Design a protein around this nucleic acid. Structure first.
Ligand SMILES: Cc1cn([C@H]2C[C@H](O)[C@@H](COP(=O)(O)OP(=O)(O)OP(=O)(O)O)O2)c(=O)[nH]c1=O
Ligand code: SF4
Ligand SMILES: [Zn+2]
Lengths: 216, 249, 216, 66, 251
DNA sequence: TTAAGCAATTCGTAATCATGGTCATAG
DNA sequence: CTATGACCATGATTACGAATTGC
């Protein structure tokens, strides 16, 4: 998306169109369409203005109803309360949640967790690696069923994988630095792709703690 | 009940090969005055009007005004299972949607087919009668060759009717050319003129219109100011066949 | 309407509608990132479904026909053949394509201006000279043919009134004109076609005489 | 002309003669005269020195699919 | 100002029908000797020399040694729009780069007047050698076309043996070997194999199918060959001049 | 200087192959 | 005038590339 910006120092801007276009996936993004979806509702105007003063009064009542609808949408959809809570949980300012993506927030939380043990971040940049293999899907038994099927699933799958096997930048073991120490049992583990990762009796990672705060 | 009998099935086969390319569906208005039809083409450009008068059928019988819905492709496939000398009778009920055709050889062999009709929701249009001011009566073979020969050059053609004769011109990327024709039985080109005419028409429609050439020897072309050009054929003591096409602006 | 080069790489319908400006307004047109609405009209260019697309307001004000065969075989048919097959066999494909077949045989629709207003019999559809509604063979059954179609005029009258007074309650006022051409409201252009249905069905019943005098 | 086209556009939006966007201009002029609200004798005297022109004898929005 | 007439004018249809499948263009050399055309082929194997003397025409006005170029197949598509009894007339202005064709009718009632535009040409031009042709054969054209087409369904290239008693048209193919023998017959249907010394050569039968496109173009066809030289097939355009197709031989 | 990820079902659009139909030429 | 052959196109089917949604 390509937008213009206008400079105002001290004051904050919240166009509700950009908030809708970022959070919601709808069919039309007109004010009439979202006011029906959430609440329930040029050349004529030039002759309502070149006429009399009750026509201009009708034009003003129309304009005031237009200027009133986004306030009702802002307070009804719990926009601003969620923006304040997002800025308090992540630690980024209130203008960054309308301009940026999801990188500045995870950079911010990782730096705020990095000052408490004394580490510095490096700069690696590469163009470019390859893809890796994603997720499995099981082959169906296609059709129509009329005997009950029960669904069992895991909740918060990938953050709990990253939590409970002690995976982090700061505990990734390089292939050589295990050698020539031979202590495998309860000092490190091995993954199906092939890496070795140190047990939690030596280090605690930084991404487990950020994830645990977000999960709570 | 409807039942007709006609001795020259060749006339029926020529009229059904006039129309099987331009039209896919039609409605036959069976009356006590004959068998009459109007239709527009599939492209919504041109009009056909066909009249087979009641007398020329050599055994006619119609009780009540009918309206039959015919797929012209299946009928054109049926009427080529009949040789050029047979005698054709048509048999229809007034309660049914299925037509019977019986072909009688002039020697031991008789054939009979049944064809399912369809109900259609078409609207019937017509024409008003005015006096077209340029009246050409010309041989049909020359008109067929003139249209087919100008067709390879470009797609439009301008008709230019002047005093002694008419002149057809056509252009294209490989050049241009005209053909004259002058006032001088059926190999003549009779030309009546009150006001001169010059107009432009596209060639694909004209090469559709010249598909019914074995129906007669001569063809009649009628023109006037800003009206659809009329192409007219006559069928001997049976009726006529007219195509209608609008000029380009 | 996404980034313009991927839509340069291969010809689409909505890109063709957007990049084709209007004569009325070369200053309001879709930009990058928004949604383009269109409908498909009927024509004879079968190689390209990107040559038959038009703006909904333009086909509203200029009254172009609709390609019912496009919508029948390309939009509707294959999702139905996904859903309805697994409960039955392939006689179910034949069952819905036969339920089409009993119902496919009912269709409704330069030189086009020179119509002679050819009248037609209401009973058996035979074009004939004179303005009377009934045919000479189907004259006895005329009370039943008047009975039939006045229950259609009666149901069009009931639909005019429910719609044109709903605009008065959505507008606010009962004493002034309605001006709302809201393209996202079903109310608009459903209130436009019933005027013409009623215009047509009222004139078909004046084929029959008047039920009495009016100048007494 | 060009001054007669603003008098009619001013007669068409005065609320004391009626809510008129479905009918003609002279019908609304005679409707107000029957009830005698106060039609002025100048919006009549331009609908007589013209023939059936669609830009005099028609309401302002006689286009416009409303 | 070039302006020429031809009453029995079917010959022009007949030559350009046998010209357009070979080559795409032609170098029309209009001299006071008449209408001439030397032109190579497109595959660099063959050549056409058309000569049309003035004494084979009817009515003539040549004021310029014109040297123009014709795209052949569009001209043939225009020549397909006139009958064979119809009179062919050509008109040309030395400043206006166009050809004005006038097709008169024998009953004079249908008049045609077509125009084809010009394109520039810088065509190559080589001279034929004049020599002794060790075998010159006069043959019916229809029988010759029949024989080489009868050989076309065996193989692709033909071997010829030209000698005193008979002439030997042999070929191989995917079904095996075959050959037909001919002899002299003891005015149009008469044959003659005039021979000094017997030879054997290789030629392309597909170019014989290309050369027999001028089958209705003469009384008799002439076949002139010698050792390792272009075969010249001759169609004597009756009372007019002659068309000679050269085929450079094979190795 | 600035940007979470991948798996896809699915249908459309384009290209290729097959099949017939029409026209022209030859006997 | 009729039959056969060739060309040409047209239609249908299959395979690939692209908006949106499921994770
Ligand atoms: C929706 C989504 C899922 N995933 C991955 C991570 C998740 O661990 C895995 C499961 O998908 P989800 O079931 O959609 O999410 P979840 O299991 O983490 O949380 P919950 O059960 O409470 O709804 O899919 C992503 O990586 N990005 C995403 O946007
Ligand atoms: S057209 Fe629809 S949106 Fe507009 S006033 Fe009527 S009901 Fe409301
Ligand atoms: Zn009737």
């Amino acid at each position: 998306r390509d937008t213009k910006v206008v400079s105002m120092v001290g004051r904050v801007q919240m166009d509700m169109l950009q908030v809708l276009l970022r959070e919601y996936k709808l069919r039309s993004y007109t004010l009439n369409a979202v006011s029906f979806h959430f609440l329930g509702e040029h050349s004529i105007i030039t002759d309502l203005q070149n006429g009399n003063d009750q026509t201009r009064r009708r034009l003003a009542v129309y304009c005031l109803k237009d200027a009133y609808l986004p306030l009702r949408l802002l307070e009804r959809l719990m926009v601003l309360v969620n923006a304040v809570e997002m800025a308090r949980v992540t630690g980024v300012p209130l203008s960054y949640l309308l301009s940026r993506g999801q990188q500045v927030k995870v950079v911010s939380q990782l730096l705020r967790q990095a000052m408490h043990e004394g580490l510095l971040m490096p700069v690696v940049k590469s163009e470019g690696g390859e893809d890796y293999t994603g997720a499995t899907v099981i082959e169906p038994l296609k059709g129509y069923y009329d005997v009950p099927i029960a669904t069992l699933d895991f909740s918060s799958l990938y953050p709990s994988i990253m939590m409970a096997h002690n995976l982090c930048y700061t505990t990734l073991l390089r292939p050589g630095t295990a050698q020539k120490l031979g202590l495998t049992e309860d000092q490190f583990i091995r993954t199906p792709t092939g890496d070795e990762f140190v047990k939690t009796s030596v280090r605690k990672g930084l991404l487990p703690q950020i994830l645990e705060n977000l999960l709570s | 009940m409807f039942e007709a009998r006609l001795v020259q099935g060749s006339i029926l086969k020529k009229v059904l090969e006039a129309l099987k390319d331009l039209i896919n569906e039609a409605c036959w208005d069976i009356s006590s005055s004959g068998v009459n039809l109007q239709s527009m083409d599939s492209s919504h450009v041109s009009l056909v009007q066909l009249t087979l008068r009641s007398e020329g059928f050599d055994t006619y019988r119609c009780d009540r005004n009918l309206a039959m819905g015919v797929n012209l492709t299946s009928m054109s496939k049926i009427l080529k299972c009949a040789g050029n000398e047979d005698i054709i009778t048509l048999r229809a009920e007034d309660n049914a949607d299925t037509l019977a055709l019986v072909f009688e050889a002039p020697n031991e062999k008789v054939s009979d087919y049944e064809m399912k009709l369809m109900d259609l929701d078409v609207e019937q249009l017509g024409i008003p009668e005015q006096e077209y001011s340029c009246v050409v009566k010309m041989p049909s073979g020359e008109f067929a060759r003139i249209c087919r020969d100008l067709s390879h050059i470009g797609d439009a053609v301008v008709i230019s009717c002047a005093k002694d004769g008419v002149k057809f011109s056509a252009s294209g990327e490989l050049g241009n050319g005209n053909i004259k024709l002058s006032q001088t039985e059926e190999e003549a080109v009779t030309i009546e003129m009150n006001e001169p005419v010059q107009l432009t028409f596209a060639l694909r429609y004209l090469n559709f219109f010249t598909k019914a050439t074995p129906l007669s020897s001569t063809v009649t072309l009628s023109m006037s100011a800003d009206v659809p050009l009329v192409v007219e054929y006559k069928i001997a003591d049976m009726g006529h066949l007219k195509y209608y096409l609008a000029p380009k602006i | 309407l996404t980034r313009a080069a991927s839509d340069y790489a291969g010809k689409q319908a909505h890109v063709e509608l957007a990049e084709r400006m209007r004569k009325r307004d070369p200053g309001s047109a879709p930009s990058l990132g928004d949604r383009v609405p269109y409908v498909i009209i009927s024509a004879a260019k079968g190689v390209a479904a990107y040559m038959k697309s038009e703006d909904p307001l333009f086909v509203l004000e200029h009254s172009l026909p609709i390609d019912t065969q496009y919508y029948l075989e390309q939009q509707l048919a294959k999702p139905l053949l996904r859903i309805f097959e697994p409960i039955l066999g392939e006689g179910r494909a034949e069952a819905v394509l036969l339920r089409g077949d009993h119902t496919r045989c009912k269709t409704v629709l330069g030189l086009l201006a020179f119509a002679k207003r050819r009248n037609c019999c209401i009973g058996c559809r035979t074009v004939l000279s004179h303005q009377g509604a009934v045919c000479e063979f189907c004259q006895p059954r005329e009370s039943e043919l008047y009975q039939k179609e006045v229950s259609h005029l009666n149901a069009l009258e009931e639909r005019f009134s429910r719609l044109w007074t709903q605009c008065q309650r959505c507008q606010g006022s009962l004493h002034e004109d309605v001006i709302c051409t809201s393209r996202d409201c079903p109310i608009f252009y459903m209130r436009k076609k019933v005027r013409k249905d009623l215009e047509d069905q009222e004139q078909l019943l004046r084929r029959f005489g008047p039920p009495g005098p009016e100048a007494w | 002309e060009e001054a007669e086209l603003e008098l009619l556009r001013q007669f068409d939006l005065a609320w004391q003669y009626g809510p008129c966007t479905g009918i003609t201009r002279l019908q609304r002029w005679c409707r107000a005269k029957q009830m005698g609200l106060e039609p002025p004798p100048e919006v009549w005297q331009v609908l007589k020195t013209h023939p059936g022109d669609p830009r005099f004898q028609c309401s302002l929005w006689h286009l416009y699919p409303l």
